[PDB]
Amino acid sequence: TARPSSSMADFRKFFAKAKHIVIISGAGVSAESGVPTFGYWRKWQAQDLATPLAFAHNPSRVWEFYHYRREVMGSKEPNAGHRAIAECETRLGKQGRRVVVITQNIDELHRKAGTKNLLEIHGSLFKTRCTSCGVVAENYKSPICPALSGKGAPEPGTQDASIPVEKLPRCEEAGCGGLLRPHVVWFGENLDPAILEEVDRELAHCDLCLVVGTSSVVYPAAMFAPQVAARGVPVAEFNTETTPATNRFRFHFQGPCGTTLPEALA
């Protein structure tokens, strides 16, 4: 029994031999890009809005929330942390070594940094799914629909837009007309089974794991690193604090991931 290590040299020793590296990322890695984690939007946190019940009973409020985040995000750029992860992958790929990013984030900032082996387990801010036809589609339009123009203001006290359901984003496929929702996995919903099998495949065979800027309170993502760790495979935690999963782990590196990751992945 002992506190987790704070030794960068010890971690780097493993990093040089690792052939299969898994990087699990949460909101923290993008909060360093000026990305608002949720952390309040008006009077609510993300867990109260990222729910099919919220959407069923006030879809306009939910769409305002997601509209705000889409518009804010578009003009955000990848940071040193995202970059270090991307460049690490690219460099190791030429050595025949695999680096894979499993992200709880829906901001696609890993995609913008150039990450190739990316598992977006909660979907994307910039994808829609039709609640009628089920079709999934990319959508970076600003604003996603006319009625949301100038809406989504985040200040407590801001009045609900109360957009009629017909004027929320609607499907344009084969004249469907169905109500669109964010293609994001919400609390109470299942992650994509196909994505989960791929996640399991990487976890079951990696020889090094990094869990990066995640609170590890969202399930089942929170169980990913401990699973790797329970194989005895070393796990390194990069955060501005400790987590409920921390003491399972080998290392804890305190501080911004923009500082600690470029060093660790050099």
């Binding site: 867990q47 909660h122 996995v185 919400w186 609390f187 109470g188 919903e189 299942n190 992650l191 089974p193 989960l196 309170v217 969202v218 399930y219 089942p220 169980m223």
Partner: peptide, 7 residues
């Protein structure tokens, strides 16, 4: 286990 939860 596939269920997204806070708990």
């Amino acid at each position: 286990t596939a269920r997204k939860s806070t708990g």
